[PDB]
Amino acid sequence: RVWRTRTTILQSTGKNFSKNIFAILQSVKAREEGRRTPIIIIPAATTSLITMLNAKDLLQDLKFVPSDEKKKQGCQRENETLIQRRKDQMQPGGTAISVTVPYRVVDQPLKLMPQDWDRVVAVFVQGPAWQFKGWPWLLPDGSPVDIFAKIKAFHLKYDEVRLDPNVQKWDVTVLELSYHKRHLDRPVFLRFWETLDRYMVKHKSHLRF
Amino acid sequence: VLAHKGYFREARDVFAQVREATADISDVWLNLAHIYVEQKQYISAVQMYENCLRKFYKHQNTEVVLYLARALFKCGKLQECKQTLLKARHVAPSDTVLMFNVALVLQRLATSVLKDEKSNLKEVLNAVKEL
Amino acid sequence: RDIAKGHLKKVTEQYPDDVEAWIELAQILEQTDIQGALSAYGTATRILQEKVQADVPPEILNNVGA
């Protein structure tokens, strides 16, 4: 009695390949037969914690600066907040080198050109809905939800201040800043860039940077 | 046949099923390693060639050792490639292909040492002799 | 063969002194469970030597060797 023969030596212990491989061959046979700009928001109203004048410190240097001194210093204004920033990013083989292409954060929204308006991906809110009047996606009833419910918003406030009732009802990310501990600012802004990057890469990666 | 036709994704799916069914067919490991090289997954391929050699051959199969050398070369591991090709040449010293590949790896090593100014005198003198 | 394997398992569990049931089970196990076949032939050998007090048949020794 012999159990291993010329036929059984070639066979698998229990798996059948025919169904899987013929499907693969059918796919191959079918082939042989031949069968971008993104956007983000900020508040223009001058009582806001982030302003058109200190914005580039908060977002570029990841450094909080009271606007008090910025106007007291006589600081001059940009037409809008668009950065061509350097940040060295690691290749899938691990070597880091920086590359950037237009991002626009909102500072003077109604001057915006027809090409750009509907680009919002993430959004810095002040609170009152009048901040968005005339913005596209604003619902004709005056409701801004088509922006905030589909887009990851941001709102910059002091840690101590009781959250704004519109913002708390709205789909907006709160950022808590200290009055006196300047060192705690950097991780907050890092969290901002983290969340913004998550959003851009998951939902607006096809937009160009 | 699918791999030879260049349909490496489909061929991978076939060989992956065969390896799932049996661990004892040497050619299934070689075919998978070849696909890993073609998909530029050199780190995995090198490991499959080394484990294939240790598991199925009681002697150094020069064709498999050459495939390992090829993977190490594409991986940029020129030092390991040199040593692997020398291991193959020790078994089959009359094979001109092994001699050619050794000469090529030696030239690449010398080219690298001579291209980078960080290389010291002992290194550069060795590179000159290798060239 | 799988049915036979099941029946002989029940037979050997109910009557572990039946040498023939152990040998028949061993012959079935040779195809898929070498350790099971060895255990079956070993049990038959043990029963033959300790209880039948008869020498081991050459066929069993050959199969155990294989």
Binding site: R1, R4, I9 | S26, A69, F73 | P58
Partner: peptide, 27 residues
């Protein structure tokens, strides 16, 4: 353009059949 000289190695996808099994015979 001159193709950068690679390692001279022909990749062969093999399907070598196993040797015929002359296993010990059961009686």
């Amino acid at each position: 353009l001159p193709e950068r000289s690679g390692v001279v190695c022909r990749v062969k996808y093999c399907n070598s059949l196993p040797d015929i099994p002359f296993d010990p015979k059961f009686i």
